[PDB]
Design a protein around this motif. Structure first.
Motif, PDB file in Angstrom:
ATOM      1  N   UNK D 127       4.369  -2.944  10.781  1.00 24.48           N
ATOM      2  CA  UNK D 127       4.065  -2.548  12.150  1.00 24.48           C
ATOM      3  C   UNK D 127       3.012  -1.450  12.129  1.00 24.48           C
ATOM      4  N   UNK D 128       1.802  -1.788  12.554  1.00 26.09           N
ATOM      5  CA  UNK D 128       0.696  -0.844  12.579  1.00 26.09           C
ATOM      6  C   UNK D 128       0.352  -0.524  14.027  1.00 26.09           C
ATOM      7  N   UNK D 129      -0.471   0.506  14.211  1.00 24.74           N
ATOM      8  CA  UNK D 129      -0.878   0.921  15.542  1.00 24.74           C
ATOM      9  C   UNK D 129      -2.356   1.278  15.545  1.00 24.74           C
ATOM     10  N   UNK D 133      -9.370   5.666  23.281  1.00 26.69           N
ATOM     11  CA  UNK D 133      -9.192   6.074  24.657  1.00 26.69           C
ATOM     12  C   UNK D 133      -7.768   6.536  24.865  1.00 26.69           C
ATOM     13  N   UNK D 134      -6.977   5.758  25.602  1.00 24.66           N
ATOM     14  CA  UNK D 134      -5.554   6.025  25.742  1.00 24.66           C
ATOM     15  C   UNK D 134      -4.696   4.848  25.314  1.00 24.66           C
ATOM     16  N   UNK D 135      -5.305   3.736  24.918  1.00 23.76           N
ATOM     17  CA  UNK D 135      -4.585   2.478  24.776  1.00 23.76           C
ATOM     18  C   UNK D 135      -3.934   2.441  23.399  1.00 23.76           C
ATOM     19  N   UNK D 136      -2.611   2.528  23.362  1.00 19.86           N
ATOM     20  CA  UNK D 136      -1.866   2.346  22.125  1.00 19.86           C
ATOM     21  C   UNK D 136      -1.546   0.866  21.970  1.00 19.86           C
ATOM     22  N   UNK D 137      -2.047   0.262  20.896  1.00 21.44           N
ATOM     23  CA  UNK D 137      -1.814  -1.144  20.591  1.00 21.44           C
ATOM     24  C   UNK D 137      -1.006  -1.208  19.308  1.00 21.44           C
ATOM     25  N   UNK D 138       0.155  -1.847  19.375  1.00 21.33           N
ATOM     26  CA  UNK D 138       1.083  -1.943  18.261  1.00 21.33           C
ATOM     27  C   UNK D 138       1.151  -3.389  17.800  1.00 21.33           C
ATOM     28  N   UNK D 139       0.932  -3.606  16.507  1.00 21.32           N
ATOM     29  CA  UNK D 139       0.979  -4.927  15.898  1.00 21.32           C
ATOM     30  C   UNK D 139       2.216  -5.021  15.020  1.00 21.32           C
ATOM     31  N   UNK D 140       3.014  -6.059  15.249  1.00 24.92           N
ATOM     32  CA  UNK D 140       4.333  -6.230  14.650  1.00 24.92           C
ATOM     33  C   UNK D 140       4.329  -7.543  13.876  1.00 24.92           C
ATOM     34  N   UNK D 188      -6.060  -3.104  13.404  1.00 25.00           N
ATOM     35  CA  UNK D 188      -6.280  -3.972  12.248  1.00 25.00           C
ATOM     36  C   UNK D 188      -7.080  -3.296  11.148  1.00 25.00           C
ATOM     37  N   UNK D 189      -7.679  -2.136  11.420  1.00 21.43           N
ATOM     38  CA  UNK D 189      -8.338  -1.384  10.361  1.00 21.43           C
ATOM     39  C   UNK D 189      -7.357  -0.541   9.558  1.00 21.43           C
ATOM     40  N   UNK D 190      -6.285  -0.056  10.187  1.00 21.77           N
ATOM     41  CA  UNK D 190      -5.321   0.796   9.487  1.00 21.77           C
ATOM     42  C   UNK D 190      -4.377   0.034   8.558  1.00 21.77           C
ATOM     43  N   UNK D 191      -4.522  -1.293   8.445  1.00 22.63           N
ATOM     44  CA  UNK D 191      -3.597  -2.093   7.648  1.00 22.63           C
ATOM     45  C   UNK D 191      -3.737  -1.803   6.159  1.00 22.63           C
ATOM     46  N   UNK D 192      -4.965  -1.646   5.668  1.00 19.23           N
ATOM     47  CA  UNK D 192      -5.125  -1.206   4.289  1.00 19.23           C
ATOM     48  C   UNK D 192      -4.833   0.277   4.130  1.00 19.23           C
ATOM     49  N   UNK D 193      -5.029   1.067   5.186  1.00 13.32           N
ATOM     50  CA  UNK D 193      -4.779   2.500   5.099  1.00 13.32           C
ATOM     51  C   UNK D 193      -3.294   2.834   5.049  1.00 13.32           C
ATOM     52  N   UNK D 194      -2.424   1.903   5.432  1.00 14.37           N
ATOM     53  CA  UNK D 194      -0.988   2.138   5.334  1.00 14.37           C
ATOM     54  C   UNK D 194      -0.542   2.184   3.874  1.00 14.37           C
TER      55      UNK D 194
ATOM     56  N   UNK G  93      12.579   0.277  10.702  1.00 15.43           N
ATOM     57  CA  UNK G  93      11.781  -0.046   9.533  1.00 15.43           C
ATOM     58  C   UNK G  93      10.494  -0.752   9.955  1.00 15.43           C
ATOM     59  N   UNK G  94       9.371  -0.479   9.283  1.00 14.04           N
ATOM     60  CA  UNK G  94       8.105  -1.109   9.685  1.00 14.04           C
ATOM     61  C   UNK G  94       8.040  -2.592   9.387  1.00 14.04           C
ATOM     62  N   UNK G  95       8.820  -3.086   8.431  1.00 13.27           N
ATOM     63  CA  UNK G  95       8.863  -4.510   8.133  1.00 13.27           C
ATOM     64  C   UNK G  95      10.205  -4.825   7.488  1.00 13.27           C
ATOM     65  N   UNK G  96      10.391  -6.101   7.152  1.00 14.14           N
ATOM     66  CA  UNK G  96      11.594  -6.513   6.440  1.00 14.14           C
ATOM     67  C   UNK G  96      11.556  -6.052   4.987  1.00 14.14           C
ATOM     68  N   UNK G  97      10.368  -6.047   4.381  1.00 11.49           N
ATOM     69  CA  UNK G  97      10.231  -5.716   2.969  1.00 11.49           C
ATOM     70  C   UNK G  97      10.199  -4.218   2.700  1.00 11.49           C
ATOM     71  N   UNK G  98       9.902  -3.398   3.701  1.00 14.89           N
ATOM     72  CA  UNK G  98       9.610  -1.990   3.480  1.00 14.89           C
ATOM     73  C   UNK G  98      10.774  -1.126   3.946  1.00 14.89           C
ATOM     74  N   UNK G  99      10.835   0.085   3.402  1.00 16.10           N
ATOM     75  CA  UNK G  99      11.665   1.135   3.953  1.00 16.10           C
ATOM     76  C   UNK G  99      13.148   0.976   3.679  1.00 16.10           C
TER      77      UNK G  99
END
Ligand code: MG
Ligand code: MG
Ligand code: MG
Ligand code: MG
Ligand code: MG
Ligand code: MG
Ligand code: MG
Ligand code: MG
Ligand code: MG
Ligand code: MG
Ligand code: MG
Ligand code: MG
Ligand code: MG
Ligand code: ZN
Lengths: 125, 215, 81, 222, 55, 97, 129
Positions: D127-129, D133-140, D188-194, G93-99
């Motif tokens: 789950x990344x974010x 601006x103000x728009x929080x977009x969460x990807x699950x 989608x840029x923070x996915x490698x940064x996680x 948890x952020x995913x099933x595999x993590x945390x």
RNA sequence: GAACGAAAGUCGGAGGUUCGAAGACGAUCAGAUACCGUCGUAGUUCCGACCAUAAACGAUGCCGACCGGCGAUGCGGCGGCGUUAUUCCCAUGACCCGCCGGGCAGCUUCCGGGAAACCAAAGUCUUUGGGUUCCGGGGGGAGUAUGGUUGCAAAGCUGAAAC
RNA sequence: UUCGUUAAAGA
């Protein structure tokens, strides 16, 4: 009266950057050189560009100029420096500065030849 | 090690140039470089860690096979003289003084370079190469004083970058250690000339006065 | 990243930082891969062998890199005693 | 059909044919400057869509001085997308500038698993974010074959990203594309940064391509 | 340098003025553009000098 | 929005400041808010100091100074040209020489 | 005034992870905190830790890694039955595999994966990933 | 539920310098009943009682912890063959240097936040939970009507609907 | 020292 245009100074800088050995201090020769090496339709513009070229020549031949620098002027800047005087590069081995750096030379092991002793009050700033 | 240790000629040149004394203001990342404060405002920098940071700066410069990828920049006139002759010494790129901001960002300017390393003299006088490092991904070696910020700086050499003799001594000793790592000058061989090219020259008033007195 | 078959599925393995053990991003232009070479004996001869220290963007912006390179190379045994 | 005239030493490495893949550039996060480098690498990354051509106005003594602002999302479907924003006085000029800036600002997309490790990843790794601006977009992360459930603009952006299955949660003014698309781009840029628990070990620390092929760069510069 | 034309258009709202001015390209040989160069433009030749000094 | 962090005056610890009268319009303004300057004039203009010194009794032994606590408000001080406007990055400055 | 000392510990741990430091100082000591950091050690997100045994209440210093993304405390310590952990799985948890999620089971301070094998369930201290 | 609560206002007692609601004029304007000037009532003062309101503001609840630096200031405490005062050790006095605690503050910062202004808190928030209290749900109607209650009264507290 | 008003729309 001589507050000439940026295009006049830019053309003169292009002339002095491309062709430097073709130019001198005489206006009546530098004008004909600039007319052999460039195309200017306007005779007043010819005279003004060639006059500022003579002014740039009198500035460069007298002193160093940052505004334009060819490889020959870079080699002249290299040549003007190598005459190195040997008067005050390293002093004699009697230096007194600080009892704190005397304690530094006591901690970090060195000779500590010269005397190092001053006393100062707390009248700093 | 055992040859990289400081010697009596080195510490005599340090005490003659006067780089052990620094500024009057502290920085929170200069506590490891200062040892003991002194009265009348002036503070004292140690010499061993200065030598070790100079050693690591020399290692980082020699670590690239191409010497042309190391850019050396100083804006103030105490370093403008030393940068040019340091670049003419071994391999560096001579550019000093007016930085022309946008040197490393845009390409419509003909003064665009692609370096791998940067060495600057004063961070407060060269805040703009410290800014433009962050778009080119290059390190920074800076001759830092006791009151100089350390943003975008990787190697900090604690010193007094205000004194012209100190700046010239540091550029001379840096070029000395770089050439001894490259193998041009051996360890038991002093330099052929006294370091005054790196120091300074005063213009034509007392220069020509001392010339006419020495005729 | 591996699957049940044990493949190498990830596109690239990013650079973990040598200061804060944090992943350097693909667009993190404030990062650096520092290079320091190894030194020989009494002769003081250059070696082609060199070690690389990755320093990331927030460390470089805060100024932790000046303390971090010396505290990283002190465990290496190349900067000091 | 024109000579490319390489610059910035990275294009000279590309035309000396020494960087075999764009993954080698993203290992080291080098700055790209010219847009045709990734066109030399990826020829199938031309799949793009303009999102919104909106006008902006400047009030001057003549009155309103209009100029058009173009958003173009490019993307290779294997996990490489870019988002370009460019304003200019002409429609086609703004579109070409946004295409070039998207080619510059292309990023790689990390593709993970929902919890089974069969293969061919189909979702975000966690789950990344992303916030612009103000728009929080969460990807699950989503199960296999679920799909993309979102607004049509970031649904198309994730479909270009190759994330086959994802859940979204947006809060803010979602109506503004100039913030909402950039927030999805940051997400989608923070996915490698996680920081992820399959990237524990110290990396290989491979050599820089400048150090690896310095001599070709020297003989092509001099 | 500039060909300028001012013409009228009669529409239902009345007459409208149209003004078309075109700056012609510089052509030193040909009847398409003018042969006189611009007085602002100062053109320079390339560096002609080359190799072979003494011996 | 906030135009000033200090909100005009210097009250940050206390909650009430004594209103001291203005000079021109005589409006009561709290003293940490009013423009409080100190003018040291010569009691004679220098165009007539030399005339009084030449036509005086003593041989240049007395030079009195007139001291006034000048106390304007910020509504009439802008009209009286003392506290002229500045820019956003220019409001942070200090006393001019 | 002073309550939820595990939250007082983990906010300091979180600020040290966001700053990028090496080792933290934590002024309370609970057996809750010691077992929580023992679980974090066993899963390797932190390192060696030393407890200065003060006569009143000690001080824990944890050698960090630079690894923790987020660690926190769920506040009221909810009573969580089995077949209701999946809500906290999808929520925390952020995913099933993590945390991992630290449970407070009947047989000691345990882990999210250890709790379904022990088949106990119980209360929640917090979460870490 | 209770104690204080600016200024104004109300009920008694003493006086009444100045200013001054209302008021009377003198002026400017097309029109002043206003801004300008003159006089002046209540009040402004003090001692007893009531009212409980404000841009009562930091337009920012309280308690506890963490996360940068710097230069100062106020109050204690500590250290420093430094200087300066008594008659001379002797004790505090004045200045200088540094530290500690909590306090009013300031400058910079890509520590992070926010829509931005800006903020070492308005941070530690989609990677969302330390405890607790009170309040907001488009703008008007409306802090109004109608009830209850407090008050000598002005009014204060609670406070809706139609449209 | 003083100087009043100009609607609905129209890009
Ligand atoms: Mg909307
Ligand atoms: Mg305003
Ligand atoms: Mg108040
Ligand atoms: Mg009262
Ligand atoms: Mg009565
Ligand atoms: Mg009365
Ligand atoms: Mg009236
Ligand atoms: Mg009166
Ligand atoms: Mg109120
Ligand atoms: Mg309250
Ligand atoms: Mg004190
Ligand atoms: Mg006392
Ligand atoms: Mg109107
Ligand atoms: Zn006034």
């Amino acid at each position: 009266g001589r507050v000439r245009t940026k295009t006049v100074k830019k053309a003169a800088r292009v002339i002095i950057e491309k062709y430097y050995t073709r130019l001198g201090n005489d206006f009546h020769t530098n004008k004909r050189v600039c007319e052999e090496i460039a195309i200017i339709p306007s005779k007043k513009l010819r005279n003004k560009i060639a006059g500022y070229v003579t002014h740039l020549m009198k500035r460069i031949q007298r002193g160093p100029v940052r505004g334009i620098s060819i490889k020959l002027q870079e080699e002249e800047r290299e040549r003007r420096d190598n005459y190195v005087p040997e008067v005050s590069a390293l002093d004699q081995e009697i230096i007194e500065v600080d009892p704190d750096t005397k304690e530094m030379l006591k901690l970090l092991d060195f000779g500590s030849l010269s005397n190092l002793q001053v006393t100062q009050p707390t009248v700093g700033m | 090690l055992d040859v990289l240790q400081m010697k009596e000629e080195d510490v005599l040149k340090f005490l003659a140039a006067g780089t052990h004394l620094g500024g009057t203001n502290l920085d929170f990342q200069m506590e490891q470089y200062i040892y003991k404060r002194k009265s009348d405002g002036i503070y004292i920098i140690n010499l061993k860690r200065t030598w070790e940071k100079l050693l690591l700066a020399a290692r980082a410069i020699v670590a690239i096979e191409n010497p042309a990828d190391v850019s050396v920049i100083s804006s103030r006139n105490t370093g403008q003289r030393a940068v040019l002759k340091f670049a003419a010494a071994t391999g560096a790129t001579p550019i000093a003084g007016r930085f022309t901001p946008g040197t490393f960002t845009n390409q419509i300017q003909a003064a665009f370079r692609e370096p791998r390393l940067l060495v600057v003299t004063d961070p407060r006088a060269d805040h703009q190469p410290l800014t433009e490092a962050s778009y080119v991904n290059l390190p920074t070696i800076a001759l830092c004083n006791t009151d100089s910020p350390l943003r975008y700086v990787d190697i900090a050499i604690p010193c007094n970058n205000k004194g012209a003799h100190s700046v010239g001594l540091m550029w001379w000793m840096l070029a000395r250690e770089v050439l001894r790592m490259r193998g041009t000058i051996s360890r038991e061989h002093p330099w052929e000339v006294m370091p005054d090219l790196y120091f300074y020259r005063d213009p034509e008033e007392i220069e020509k006065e001392e010339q006419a007195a020495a005729e | 990243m591996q699957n049940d078959a044990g493949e190498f599925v990830d596109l690239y393995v990013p650079r973990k930082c040598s200061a804060s053990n944090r992943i350097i991003g693909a667009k993190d232009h404030a990062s650096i891969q520092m290079n320091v070479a190894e030194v020989d004996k009494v002769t003081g001869r250059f070696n082609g062998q060199f070690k690389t220290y990755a320093i990331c963007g927030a460390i470089r912006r805060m100024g932790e890199s000046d303390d971090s390179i010396l505290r990283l190379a002190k465990a290496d045994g190349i900067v000091s005693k | 059909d024109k000579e490319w005239m390489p610059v910035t030493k990275l294009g000279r490495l590309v035309k000396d044919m020494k960087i075999k893949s764009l993954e080698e550039i993203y290992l080291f996060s080098l700055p790209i400057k010219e847009s045709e480098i990734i066109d030399f690498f990826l020829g199938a990354s031309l799949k793009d869509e303009v999102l919104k051509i909106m006008p902006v106005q400047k009030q001057t003594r003549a009155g309103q001085r209009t100029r058009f602002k173009a958003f173009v999302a490019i993307g290779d479907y294997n996990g490489h997308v870019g988002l370009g924003v460019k304003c200019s006085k002409e429609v086609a000029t703004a579109i070409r500038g946004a295409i070039i800036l998207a080619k510059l600002s292309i990023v790689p997309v990390r593709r993970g698993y929902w919890g089974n490790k069969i293969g061919k990843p189909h979702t975000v790794p966690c789950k990344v974010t992303g916030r612009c601006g103000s728009v929080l977009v969460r990807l699950i992360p989503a199960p296999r074959g679920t799909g993309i459930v979102s607004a049509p603009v970031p649904k198309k952006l994730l479909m270009m990203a190759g994330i086959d299955d994802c859940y979204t949660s947006a809060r803010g003014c979602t109506a503004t594309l100039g913030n909402f698309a950039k927030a999805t781009f940051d997400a989608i840029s923070k996915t490698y940064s996680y920081l992820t628990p399959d990237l524990w070990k110290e990396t290989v620390f491979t050599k820089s391509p400048y150090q690896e092929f310095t001599d070709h760069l020297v003989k092509t510069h001099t | 340098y500039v060909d300028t034309a001012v013409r009228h258009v009669l529409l239902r709202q009345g007459v409208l003025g149209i003004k078309v001015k075109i700056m012609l390209p510089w052509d030193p040989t040909g009847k398409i553009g003018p042969k006189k160069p611009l007085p602002d433009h100062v053109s320079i030749v390339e560096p002609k000098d080359e190799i072979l000094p003494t011996t | 929005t906030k135009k000033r962090r200090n909100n005009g005056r210097a009250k940050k610890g206390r909650g009430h400041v004594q209103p001291i009268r203005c000079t021109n319009c005589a409006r009561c303004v709290p003293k940490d808010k009013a423009i409080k300057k100190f003018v040291i004039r010569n009691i004679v203009e220098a165009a007539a100091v030399r005339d009084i010194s030449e036509a005086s009794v003593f041989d240049a032994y007395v030079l009195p100074k007139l001291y006034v606590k000048l106390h304007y408000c910020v509504s009439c001080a802008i009209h009286s040209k003392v506290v002229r406007n500045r820019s956003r990055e220019a409001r942070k400055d200090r006393t001019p020489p | 005034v002073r309550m939820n000392v595990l939250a007082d510990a983990l906010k300091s741990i979180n600020n040290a992870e966001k700053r990028g430091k090496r080792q933290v100082l934590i002024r309370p000591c609970s057996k809750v905190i010691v077992r929580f950091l023992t679980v974090m050690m066993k899963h390797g997100y932190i390192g060696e830790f030393e407890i200065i045994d003060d006569h009143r209440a000690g001080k824990i210093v944890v050698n960090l890694t630079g690894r923790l993304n987020k660690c926190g405390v769920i506040s009221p310590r909810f009573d969580v039955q089995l077949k209701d952990l999946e809500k906290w799985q999808n929520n925390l948890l952020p995913s099933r595999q993590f945390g991992f999620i630290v449970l407070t089971t009947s047989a000691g301070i345990m882990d999210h994966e250890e709790a379904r094998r022990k088949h106990t369930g119980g209360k929640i201290l917090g979460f870490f990933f």
